[PDB]
Amino acid sequence: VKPNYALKFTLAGHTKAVSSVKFSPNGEWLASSSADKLIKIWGAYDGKFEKTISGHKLGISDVAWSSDSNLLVSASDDKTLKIWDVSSGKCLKTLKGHSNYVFCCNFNPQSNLIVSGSFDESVRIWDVKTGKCLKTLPAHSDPVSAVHFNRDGSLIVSSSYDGLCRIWDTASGQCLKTLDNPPVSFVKFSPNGKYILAATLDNTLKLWDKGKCLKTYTGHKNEKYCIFANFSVTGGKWIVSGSEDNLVYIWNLQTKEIVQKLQGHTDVVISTACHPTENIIASAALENDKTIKLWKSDC
């Protein structure tokens, strides 16, 4: 039992490396960010280009949606985040305070807060309404590669090149858990909150419960980039990630076997995303490629 993702659409238009793609929670849209300093919005089901959003002064490493699908936040080498009204394309707020590139970002499920991680080694928590920084966590001793909230916003998980994954109490700022030593290049909670998936730059993904690793997925290449990984849960239960051999890998969540590889890109697949209700994967690639692809499966 394996999925049968097949290519349906190629979303071309960025003019440099794509950095991150995300489906909107309502399923209607895909947002992408790129080194070309733009964000683009695309139809999730037919890949139709919808709009270009502009204003960052340097390349963008991440983008993320608010719960209601009405706002985006982006993280840029310009040391700022920006909050966007996706209807109008306008920048509502510029979040200033990091002292080096902002690398990763996310809303909480309430979407009154944004969390960011930076090459400055900190995690910052921001008020969406005022754009003010509410907390700066001295979270890591090297760049922060990922930050994500759990399902009720009560926890944040962060990962870093310093080899640590840390779970934080949002409200108190306290570190509740620290999860060898390879750089941790990506982390996220599962769609239900109960697990975390972490990538390390030794070509390994791990599913963690107790502070214990329950599964390890390997076979792909990941020694250089902060590649997004995902749980796919609309059909069969898979783990999905890009890879530095230019493929999308899909693994069986429970058996850990590779069940499909998707071939379309001519550079590192930096980012993948899984649609919230249909079996659709978006993939995006770096400078030699510059495209996003939409793939669909019957399971």
Binding site: S34, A35, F103, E287
Partner: peptide, 11 residues
């Protein structure tokens, strides 16, 4: 040009 699209050099 962004941080995500530049490699973390190991060795």
């Amino acid at each position: 040009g962004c941080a995500r699209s530049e490699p973390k050099i190991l060795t």
